[PDB]
Amino acid sequence: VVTEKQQMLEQHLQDVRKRVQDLEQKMKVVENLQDDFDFNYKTLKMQQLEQMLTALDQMRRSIVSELAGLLSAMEYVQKTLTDEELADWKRRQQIACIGGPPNICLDRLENWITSLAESQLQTRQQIKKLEELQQKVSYKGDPIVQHRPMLEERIVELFRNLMKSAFVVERQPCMPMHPDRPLVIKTGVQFTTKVRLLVKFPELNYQLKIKVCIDKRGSRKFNILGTNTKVMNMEENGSLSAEFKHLTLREQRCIVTEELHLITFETEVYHQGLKIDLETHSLPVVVISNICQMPNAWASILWYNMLTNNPKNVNFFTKPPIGTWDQVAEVLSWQFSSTTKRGLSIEQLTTLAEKLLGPGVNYSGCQITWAKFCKENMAGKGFSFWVWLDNIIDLVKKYILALWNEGYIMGFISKERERAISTKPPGTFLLRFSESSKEGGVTFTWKTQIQSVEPYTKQQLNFAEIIMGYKIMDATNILVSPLVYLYPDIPKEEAFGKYCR
Predict the structure, then answer these.
(1) Can you list the positions of beta strands (E) in 201-289?
(2) Among candidate residues 264, 241, 371, the one with its CA nearest the CA of residue 311
(3) Which CATH homologous superfamily contains domain 168-290?
(4) What is d(CA 392, CA 403) in angstroms, rounded to the nearest whole number?
(5) Residue 86 contacts by C-beta under 8 Å, 6 or more apart in sequence?
(6) Other remarks on record?
(7) 181 vs 144, 151, 169, 175, 300, CA distance in Å?
(8) Which of the four CATH numbers 3.30.420.40, 1.10.238.10, 3.40.50.1000, 2.60.40.10 does domain 291-412 have?
């Protein structure tokens, strides 16, 4: 969809696109009225020269002040493009990295930037057309001579920046085998990143070679390996980009999941006779040694994005900021909505808000520190909040995926609150995650006292049957049955029978 700030932008842009049509014209007309003058003077080589000149001077004056104003105009819109609607995208990328509401399609921005740069480049060819007359007809008091060096300088500035800013990291660095784990890369593993130049110029095609490096205190300095450089070209929406598939890492030899490193891409550009200094970098990355540090890092990733939107601040954990539950809550939800077709209801999100902050009402302004989140172990438990939860995710994703599809999983529910269930017909059941087991456990629940069996870990799930079998042989020496009706009142057959062989 289009915001109304975007209206103003695609607007601003066509108004400039329009002034370059007018200047386009003015230039043509004045060039002619100056050729008549040249001819009349090379023909008399008496008055319609003394005047023709008083006139040409008034053209120059107008044309030149027309350009000054046109530039003042491009200065404006570029700032609304770059500093506003681009920063906007960059932050929306940040957030879509950690499973947030996506849509970071560089198209709208590419046309706006492409359009603006196309203008600026015609405007440079206008100012050049001026120094053409600064040469065919000049005189003392020549407006051109004392304004064209000026304008040239000015417009070149504008492009130089627009150009630089148009250089981004389209798709952040990420191992193809850990798609959901971007910005966290294991040394020795091969990944794929990708840059894009939002000044889609067909002339530039194939003309740009990008060179990605890596770091250039006390931290571990690494070094990328393989096809270290790539040439930028228009292959796939014919946009200027270079993808670096098959890149590996290693460590320059001779904490860790809290250590950030930046990757830099670079290439110079020479066009219409100019040297441009192009270079962009990726969102801070945590490099790991073993796939065990996978979570503890992905944690840092999330914590960084969720908070600061600063792209260059590796020493983020030099003093990690705080983070009201609200934000955290949302972020957590995403992980589910990202992979699955569901996140966390404010219900499961509460028995979980407390599962962290403990007892209390309304967990909103409730500040959570980095430590708290995962740097610290749960009250009784022998592990941390995050650590525990990461498998609860991987569990849902890998095992019991389409199984969690239609809810079916209360997942998070205070063992206590799990009592008011002391309502339905004896036999109805839940589906929770063991709060005690670090490697993820999916159990179940049934004065008709209540009873939740021993959780079942991943190795076991090697479940639509544990819910169709489990007899719990009885005391009346009768291998009883698996308590029916999912929480609602759904007899475990229309809910469970489908996925059954």
Answers:
(1) 208-211, 222-225, 229-232, 240-251, 260-261, 264-270, 275-281, 285-288
(2) 264
(3) STAT transcription factor, DNA-binding domain (2.60.40.630)
(4) 14
(5) 109, 165
(6) Involved in the gp130-mediated signaling pathway.
(7) 57, 48, 17, 8, 12
(8) 1.10.238.10
